[PDB]
């Protein structure tokens, strides 16, 4: 009986993966794509900024008395080129390592989950049917206490085997469904951890490049008196 | 004579500020605007990403056996909200503190530099003219050795005073022009240093938020065997 409760729970996990998880995953992939289209816009415009800033650098470089401000501006653009390319690194961790691999799994998963649920439903119904029918055969013999005929005991053995088989099937089927769910969330968490490690390397790079060059830049226009 | 060389150098510095520096600065302001329009695109799309990621979080949260993966995904979105808002901080250091103040100075500088150069040109020509004319008056007396009349010596004193006045005027005018140039590059370098300090605080924030949470995230789907 708790068997039937478990059977419905199992059906519900497959339905939850197919109608909630995978569509939400489709949406997450679409946001990721938008995000990367945006991030490309910002990389590009960062370019035009830092070229316009090297232009001002070239002008100072050619003057009397502001040459080292020319150097400062060159270095600010350079620091940004180094920071940017630690960002373009995090960016491809995003495309090849996250968006592509999610798209690849979710594509195959439609067929895979429709087939698994269906195979499970068929097997569970076929074991249920065979059990009910053994039980009916027995109820027939038994209708027309501590006494069993040879054939009654054979039916008893068979019902006991099929009932054990059915309960194990439903028990394992439930564990397997919960494991299918956890795998899909684990993979998602893993792909996010990998982009994260690259965000950490990008932010660490920026801190140390700036920590290096900023105090010299702040000194360039200080009172020398 | 080296006076005339210095006079032309001075004219050239004002021409360089008005025809090279300020137009390049106009262009830099336009790139900065584009850059900030882009950066707004990326902040927005980062939003849609991290909402789609909280959605996946909510799903794990409601399951049997993947709840703590729900927590992990919540924390990844949270870390991103904290990183983003240290970025929105660097962003307004960019708008109110850099783009606005550059636009404000370059607006008034057109009139200011046209007027300064012009005032200088007029004063320098007026001192030159007066000197030449004193000198001609003297050459007249002197035409029709170690002998000077009272009036010849008075002209000599006056020429010497005007010539000293002219040379100081050109000498100071050159120093002042080079100082006008250096001020405009200094201000530019200062506004960039201020945005930089905020980039440093944004990258430092990201490093430490990730340093904190990443190892727990990497543990969430490890073999427990």
């Amino acid at each position: 009986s708790r068997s039937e409760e478990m059977h419905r729970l199992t059906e519900n996990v497959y339905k939850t993966i197919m109608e909630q998880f995978n569509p939400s995953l489709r949406n997450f992939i679409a946001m990721g794509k938008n995000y990367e289209k945006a991030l490309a816009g910002v990389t590009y415009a960062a370019k035009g900024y830092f070229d316009a800033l090297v232009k001002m650098g070239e002008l100072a470089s050619e003057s009397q008395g502001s040459k080292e401000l020319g150097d400062v501006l060159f270095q600010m653009a350079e620091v940004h080129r180094q920071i940017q390319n630690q960002l373009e690194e995090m960016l491809k961790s995003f495309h090849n390592e996250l968006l592509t691999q999610l798209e690849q799994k979710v594509e195959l998963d439609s067929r895979y989950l429709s087939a698994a649920l269906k195979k499970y439903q068929t097997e569970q119904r076929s074991k249920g049917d065979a059990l009910d029918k053994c039980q009916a055969e027995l109820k027939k013999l038994r209708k027309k206490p501590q006494k069993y005929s040879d054939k009654e005991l054979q039916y008893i053995d068979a019902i006991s085997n099929k009932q054990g088989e059915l309960e194990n099937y439903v028990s394992d089927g439930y564990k397997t469904a919960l494991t299918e769910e956890r795998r899909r969330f684990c993979f998602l968490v893993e792909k996010q951890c990998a982009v994260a490690k690259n965000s950490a390397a990008y932010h660490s790079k920026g801190k140390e490049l700036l920590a290096q060059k900023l105090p010299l830049w702040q000194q360039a226009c200080a009172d020398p008196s | 004579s080296r006076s005339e060389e210095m006079h032309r150098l001075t004219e050239n510095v004002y021409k360089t500020i008005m025809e090279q520096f300020n137009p390049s600065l106009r262009n830099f302001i336009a790139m900065g605007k584009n850059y900030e329009k882009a950066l707004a695109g990326v902040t927005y799309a980062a939003k849609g990403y991290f909402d789609a990621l909280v959605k996946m979080g909510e799903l794990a949260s409601e399951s049997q056996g993947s709840k703590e993966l729900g927590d992990v995904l919540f924390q990844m979105a949270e870390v991103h909200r904290q990183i983003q808002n240290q970025l929105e901080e660097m962003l307004k250091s960019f708008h109110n503190e850099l783009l606005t103040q550059l636009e404000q100075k370059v607006e008034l500088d057109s009139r200011y530099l046209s007027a300064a150069l012009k005032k200088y040109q007029t004063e320098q020509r007026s001192k030159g003219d007066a000197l030449d004319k004193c000198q001609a008056e003297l050459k007249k007396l002197r035409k029709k050795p170690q002998k000077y009349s009272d009036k010849e010596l008075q002209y000599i004193d006056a020429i010497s005073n005007k010539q000293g006045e002219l040379e100081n005027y050109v000498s100071d005018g050159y120093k002042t022009a080079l100082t006008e140039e250096r001020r405009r590059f200094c201000f530019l370098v200062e506004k960039q240093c201020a945005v930089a300090k905020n980039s440093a605080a944004y990258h430092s924030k990201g490093k430490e938020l990730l340093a904190q949470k990443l190892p727990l995230w990497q543990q969430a789907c490890a073999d427990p065997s």
Binding site: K105, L108, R183, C186, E190 | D223
Partner: peptide, 12 residues
Amino acid sequence: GTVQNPYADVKT
């Protein structure tokens, strides 16, 4: 030929 799980080798 039954259908292969796209997540077969994902550790939990």
